Structure 1
Amino acid sequence: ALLFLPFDLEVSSMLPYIVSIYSVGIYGLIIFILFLLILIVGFIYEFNTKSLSITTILHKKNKALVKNLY
């Protein structure tokens, strides 16, 4: 929910480019890609950190039964 806000602002930042794509030409297109490439590092970061999972409080772990024989 917190990470929704940074990505929502990123989506809202593309609105100026939508209606000016022709005027900015290739210069604006390259800048638009650079805007998205810097934000794609955040996407890589969230994938590798697994930050978009569900924070359970219980964890099911399989204990091994062992015998301290004599």
Structure 2
Amino acid sequence: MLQDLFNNYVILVGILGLIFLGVNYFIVESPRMDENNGNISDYIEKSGPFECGFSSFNPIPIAFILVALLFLPFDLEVSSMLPYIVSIYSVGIYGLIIFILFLLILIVGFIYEFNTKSLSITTILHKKNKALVKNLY
């Protein structure tokens, strides 16, 4: 109850954010002071990418993309258990049995991803070997 004190805190952090932005624009010495060689926009050499010194010119695997997609179901499962947390008492045994069913259905989803090895990054593009066999004629 009564969040006026929290509201002022939210305002203060927002105001404090601009102070992080603005303090640099005032404290730093101007370009002419250090070497004057050029502005940030003009100094393309400095205002450029870093590639260990030498100039150069994310197709991520299926698993990494598959782990991210599977986060959406499992996160909705966990975030839908919130109603049971604040009402674990009143729903009594009936809620507890329903709750376990609501997980056992989702365990089958957990079981299914376990067997197919969908999470593993997998290494099929390489690491192949063969046994040398003489072919006498």
Give the TM-score of the pair, scaled to structure 1: 0.93
Is residue 40 from structure 1 mapped to residue 107 from structure 2 by the alignment? yes
Name stretches of at least 5 consecutive residues in structure 2 with no aligned partner: 1-67
Higher relative helix content: 1
Higher relative strand content: 1
Give the TM-score of the pair, scaled to structure 2: 0.49
Matched residues in 2 for 1:2 and 1:20: separation? Answer: 30
Give, in angstroms, the shift of residue 3 of structure 1: 0.3
Is residue 29 from structure 1 mapped to residue 96 from structure 2 by the alignment? yes
User: What do residues 14-56 of structure 1 show as CA deviations (whole Å, max 9, x unaligned)?
Assistant: 0000000001000000000000000000111000000111154
Between stretches 57-66 and 1-10, larger displacement belongs to 57-66
| CA pair 51-16 structure 1, distance change in 2 beyond 3 A | same
Larger-gyration structure (1/2):
2
Give, in angstroms, the shift of residue 59 of structure 1: 2.4
Give, in angstroms, the shift of residue 67 of structure 1: 1.2
Name stretches of at least 5 consecutive residues in structure 1 with no aligned partner: none
SS of residue paired to 1:2: helix
Q: Among all aligned residue pairs of Structure 1 and Structure 2, give the percentage whose two residues are the same amino acid.
A: 100
Matched residues in 2 for 1:39 and 1:54: separation? Answer: 23
Aligned length: 70
